[PDB]
Structure formats: structure tokens, C-alpha cells
Curated annotation (Swiss-Prot), chain A:
DNA-dependent RNA polymerase catalyzes the transcription of DNA into RNA using the four ribonucleoside triphosphates as substrates. Largest and catalytic component of RNA polymerase II which synthesizes mRNA precursors and many functional non-coding RNAs. Forms the polymerase active center together with the second largest subunit. Pol II is the central component of the basal RNA polymerase II transcription machinery. During a transcription cycle, Pol II, general transcription factors and the Mediator complex assemble as the preinitiation complex (PIC) at the promoter. The C-terminal domain (CTD) serves as a platform for assembly of factors that regulate transcription initiation, elongation, termination and mRNA processing. The lineage of its organism: Eukaryota, Fungi, Dikarya, Ascomycota, Saccharomycotina. It is found in: Nucleus. It comes from Saccharomyces cerevisiae (strain ATCC 204508 / S288c) (Baker's yeast). The chain holds residues 1287 to 1398 of 1733 of the full protein. It comes from the Eukaryota. This is DNA-directed RNA polymerase II subunit RPB1.
UniProtKB/Swiss-Prot annotation, chain B:
DNA-dependent RNA polymerases catalyze the transcription of DNA into RNA using the four ribonucleoside triphosphates as substrates. Common component of RNA polymerases I, II and III which synthesize ribosomal RNA precursors, mRNA precursors and many functional non-coding RNAs, and small RNAs, such as 5S rRNA and tRNAs, respectively. Pol II is the central component of the basal RNA polymerase II transcription machinery. RNA polymerases are composed of mobile elements that move relative to each other. One of its GO terms (cellular component) is cytoplasm. The keyword Hydrolase does not apply. This is DNA-directed RNA polymerases I, II, and III subunit RPABC2. The chain holds residues 72 to 154 of 155 of the full protein. Belongs to the archaeal Rpo6/eukaryotic RPB6 RNA polymerase subunit family. Present with 6090 molecules/cell in log phase SD medium. One of its GO terms (biological process) is transcription by RNA polymerase II. Keywords: Cytoplasm, DNA-directed RNA polymerase, Nucleus, Phosphoprotein, Ribosome biogenesis, Transcription. The lineage of its organism: Eukaryota, Fungi, Dikarya, Ascomycota, Saccharomycotina. It is found in: Cytoplasm; Nucleus.
Swiss-Prot record, chain C:
Component of the RNA polymerase II (Pol II) complex consisting of 12 subunits. Interacts with DEF1; the interaction is direct and serves to bridge RPB1 to the Elongin complex in a DNA-damaged dependent manner. Interacts with the Elongin subunit ELA1. Interacts with the Elongin subunit ELC1. Interacts with ASK10. Interacts with ESS1. Interacts with RTT103. Interacts with SHE2. Belongs to the RNA polymerase beta' chain family. This is DNA-directed RNA polymerase II subunit RPB1. It is found in: Nucleus. DNA-dependent RNA polymerase catalyzes the transcription of DNA into RNA using the four ribonucleoside triphosphates as substrates. Largest and catalytic component of RNA polymerase II which synthesizes mRNA precursors and many functional non-coding RNAs. Forms the polymerase active center together with the second largest subunit. Pol II is the central component of the basal RNA polymerase II transcription machinery. During a transcription cycle, Pol II, general transcription factors and the Mediator complex assemble as the preinitiation complex (PIC) at the promoter. The C-terminal domain (CTD) serves as a platform for assembly of factors that regulate transcription initiation, elongation, termination and mRNA processing. It comes from the Eukaryota.
Swiss-Prot record, chain D:
Belongs to the archaeal Rpo5/eukaryotic RPB5 RNA polymerase subunit family. Keywords: DNA-binding, DNA-directed RNA polymerase, Nucleus, Ribosome biogenesis, Transcription. Signal peptide: none annotated. DNA-dependent RNA polymerases catalyze the transcription of DNA into RNA using the four ribonucleoside triphosphates as substrates. Common component of RNA polymerases I, II and III which synthesize ribosomal RNA precursors, mRNA precursors and many functional non-coding RNAs, and small RNAs, such as 5S rRNA and tRNAs, respectively. Pol II is the central component of the basal RNA polymerase II transcription machinery. RNA polymerase complexes are composed of mobile elements that move relative to each other. Component of the RNA polymerase I (Pol I), RNA polymerase II (Pol II) and RNA polymerase III (Pol III) complexes. Component of the RNA polymerase I (Pol I) complex consisting of 14 subunits: RPA135, RPA190, RPC40, RPA14, RPB5, RPO26, RPA43, RPB8, RPA12, RPB10, RPC19, RPC10, RPA49 and RPA34. The complex is composed of a horseshoe-shaped core containing ten subunits (RPA135, RPA190, RPB5, RPO26, RPB8, RPB10, RPC10, RPA12, RPC19 and RPC40) where RPA135 and RPA190 form the DNA-binding cleft. Its main location: nucleus. Pfam families: RNA_pol_Rpb5_C (PF01191), RNA_pol_Rpb5_N (PF03871). It is found in: Nucleus.
Amino acid sequence: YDRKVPSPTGEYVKEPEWVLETDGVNLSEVMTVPGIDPTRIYTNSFIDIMEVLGIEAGRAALYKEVYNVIASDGSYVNYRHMALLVDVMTTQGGLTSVTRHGFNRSNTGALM
Amino acid sequence: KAIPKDQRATTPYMTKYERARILGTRALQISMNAPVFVDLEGETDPLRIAMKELAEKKIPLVIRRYLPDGSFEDWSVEELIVD
Amino acid sequence: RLVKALEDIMVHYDNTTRNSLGNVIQFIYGEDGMDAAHIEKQSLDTIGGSDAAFEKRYRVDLLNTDHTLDPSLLESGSEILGDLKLQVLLDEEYKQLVKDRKFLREVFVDGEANWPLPVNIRRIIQNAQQTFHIDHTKPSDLTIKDIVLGVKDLQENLLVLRGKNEIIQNAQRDAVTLFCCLLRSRLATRRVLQEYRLTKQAFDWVLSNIEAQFLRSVVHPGEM
Amino acid sequence: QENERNISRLWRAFRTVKEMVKDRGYFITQEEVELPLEDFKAKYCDSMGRPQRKMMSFQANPTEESISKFPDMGSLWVEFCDEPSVGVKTMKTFVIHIQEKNFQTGIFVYQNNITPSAMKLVPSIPPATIETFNEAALVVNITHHELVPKHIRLSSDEKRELLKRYRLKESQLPRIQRADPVALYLGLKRGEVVKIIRKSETSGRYASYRICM
């Protein structure tokens, strides 16, 4: 994978590096192993990021997951809308489902 | 509970919703034989007369902006900077 | 599911996105307070370019011959050279641009300079040059204190929150930091005296247009 | 072999402990955290090679700024354990030791697991608390990750000022669970507001305010 890193000449330079793609998931164990950066690691399952790295990491990871499908479709959506959506799913702590069990199980008025 | 004039911390600019409802209510009053404060240039449509009064700030109204805590402010449409 | 999921969410008359029950989702709509109908893709001139181009552009020396100022650019160029005060102001502006470059290095780690931001400065500059008949080989009547103090006085005029407390001004500065960095990047002494060759009425007109369009790019409270 | 690797993991975990206590507001110098592995092995390891976690237990003292901001903040006592399964008697020695030394808070680190009776014998001395952390969980500091922004624990006056300027109730703020490894990292309690400084890509510096459950 090419990585844009700043050169001491004032502009970024693509510097390829070997990166390990992985099938299956186990974040906690992999993080503790010596020989890798414990400060860098990603998971396609945002749930594990929430559990291990906490609520803020769960938020950012959720935003990345949503943004990914958008960019994959070949479409552009403004930052505002996605940010609002992500925030709503995280304002009660943890991850909140968008379901009929995800906002009809919390008070908003009986009619709503 | 009516915030005083020295503590009004809302936007002094008139929004599109405030201009819309001011032109709609003012035009509705003009359609119902309201005293016009501006000399007409030959207009017949009430909305054009309402916009003519808004262009010179002769509309005698004041907006009660509701705050989320239950309070409100009184920003007269004459002191509101349009556009 | 999306429509019925996001419905009772709006922005009240305090520039804070909160639902009907009062639960605050975002303290500022879009984390900037700008509507999605006045944002245009802009380029950040602070991170773009090499170090030799950065120091070649943002250094206007008066007591040194490394990055000296060409006196033929402005009418009073023979009197600007040798001034210590304007050189100190250029030092403060240059240090501010360097701090903005480190900040942009920490914010955007991918290296991209194109990001959506309000207010198009290029169209204002072109409208000023085509309006005031600003052509090449024309000495300008501006100085260093007019551009530096003009930008510094324009940075205080940018207002999104109408408060006066500590947290309100902190959120205002943290919500205007990037745009102020863009204005400090596009509004340099070398970029105006060398390339643009703007005059007094043209520069003041550009300032009034930037402040005006910034006051029109604010999101309106009450929009769903 | 396995001994040197366990010494390395215990050294990185101990460094994470010093970083966590330093982030709480206790006086630990930078050179004390940046202590190399050879010195740690040259201090807390016997002639045979096995580390001594009983000697690694130390005391933490709050900084002057932490006392100036939080006048009710007291000292801390950090202990470890050489037993794989922490018994109830060791926890009794820890609680009685805290009660004798009169510490406001306490941190006990275990290796594998602790008996449920000890976990039940934790909220026994109010208003003092005891933080039980795992040795395998504190190997990597979660605050040094890129997806984790900066958190600052506020006070009571700043909380009332925030709720007064924003005109909010305590329930109207975004809530954060106690089970958060960040909340356990900072040692948050019920009714404490924290500030989250994050680097957004549309404003440069975005601030948020959360409150524990």
C-alpha cells in the first residue's frame, strides 16, 4: 500500500509499505502482539472498535463505514449530513440501532 | 420571560422564514383592507404591496423569537437587517 | 427507516442542533454552522507548495536581501525598505502562517489541500481586478500595515455566534480557525502587492465582499 | 524465552500505568515514564530473572495544578499482585492497607482473574474507590491511538457554568457509559462532565461535552 507521508522537501511523497490484510477478526489479541504498531489498526466491524477502543473510536469508525459505501457507489455526499447521522446513533452512549427497536424503545411521546 | 434589549443575543438578520411569514401575514392584512403606510405606484396585487412595505421597513410588526428554554425575544422588523 | 429515523431534528435560535425533547445531537450544525447551499471546493495555499516555495512566497524581507521586497511593486517601495516595524509585522504574519501550516499538517494527514469551504475568494479577486481596471505594470498605493492590519481587522468581523461569554467565543474561534487560516493564506502581502496589485478601494471592496459573503453563508436557524 | 517476553509485556504495561496515572493528574516526571527496559529489569528483577511486582507497587501524589483545580483530590496508591488468581485475603490486605494509609482512591492490578467475593468487597469504604484493572488489558494505552481524541475531566464549577451557558439539564447532555475503557482510564464517576477535543475535517478543532451514566 502506498502511503502519503511528508517529505523534508515540503510536499508529500508516496512511500509503499507492506500492510497485512486479514480474514477473520480478533482485535484485542492482535493489538497486544509485539512487532506491530499498537497505535494503528483498523477493523471493518465497528462494533469491536467500540468495545475495545471506546465510544469516540466507535463514532469515527462508524463514520468511516458509512462514508465507505458512499464513495464505493461513486457518489458525493456533504460532510454535514453524514456527521449528523453518525452523531444521532451515538448520543445515548454506545451504538444505537436504526430499527423499530432503536427509537421506539426510548421516550419521545407516545404518538411519535 | 422577555429578554431585555441589552441581552438580545440572537442573529440581527431577518431569515427567509421570518421574511416569508412577515410578507404573508402583511399581505393577508393588506388583502383585508389594512392601512397602507407607503404610497402605491399603481399596484393591485397585495403581495407586491407587502414587499413594497418591506423594502422601506414600514411594516408595523415585531417578531417574538422563541428560545429553546421557554424564553423569547422581541426583534422588530424595522430594526431587523433584511438581506 | 431513514426518514422516520431523522425527523424531529432541527436547529433552534441558538445555532445548536437539538431534537424536540431538547437532546443536543450537535452543538453546531455541521460542526461549522454553514448551510449546504453556499459551500464550494477551495484550495489551501498554506500546505500546498514546497518549503522553498513557502519561504519564497510568505517572506517579504525589508532589512535582509534573502527575500527582499521589489520596490517597483508599490509606489512607496523606496520608503518601505529599511523599516523595522513592518518587518516585525511580517515576522508575526509569517510565524502565524507557519503555525497554520503545522496545524494543517496535524489536521489533514493525507496531503490534500482541496476541501469544501464557504466564500469563493478567487471570484472576488477577479471581480475586483475587472471592476477597478487593475492591470499589470501598475504600482499599488497599499502598504504592509494596510494589508496586515486589514486582515487582522477582518478576522474579528467574522461572527457566527452572537454571544460574548467564554465558551461561546471559544466555540467561535474553534469554528472559525480553518477559515481564518484560509484568509491568512490567500491574503498575504506578497500575493496582493506582487500578483494581484490591488489598490485601496479594491482591497477594501474585497474585504467587504468576503465579510458580506461570510455573513450570507451562515446557516439559518429553524431549518429541518 | 517466555520469561523475557513476560518482562517486556510487564514493562510496557507498567509504562501504560505510569501514563494513565500521569493523565489523571498525579506528579510523575517524563523521565520516570520514559524509563528503559534494561533499567526496569535492573531494578525490579531478582538475580534469577523473575520480576517482583510487590516492589513495583508505588505511591502517586497529585500535581499542584490538580489540587488548585480539584481541592478534594487526594493521593493514590498503586499495587500489583504476584498471584495468578487474586484471593480474597490479598484484597482484604489491599482494602485494609488503603484504610490505614488513608488514600482517597486506589488501583489494584491483577494477572488473570479475581474471586467474586473480592469484587463484592470493593464498595465498602465510602467515598473511596478501588479500580481493578487487568495486566493483559493495560498492555497498550488506548489514548495513544489515532481514533481516540483528547479527553479532559472538568470540575463542578465548570460543569455548572456549562449547563448555565447552554441552558441544559444533566440528562440533555450526550451520555457516556462507565464501562468505557476511556472512562475507566480517567476514572470517572456518576455526574462528571468530560470534554472531548477532536480534530474535525471541516472546522479543524471541534469540542464536545459528555456526562457519565
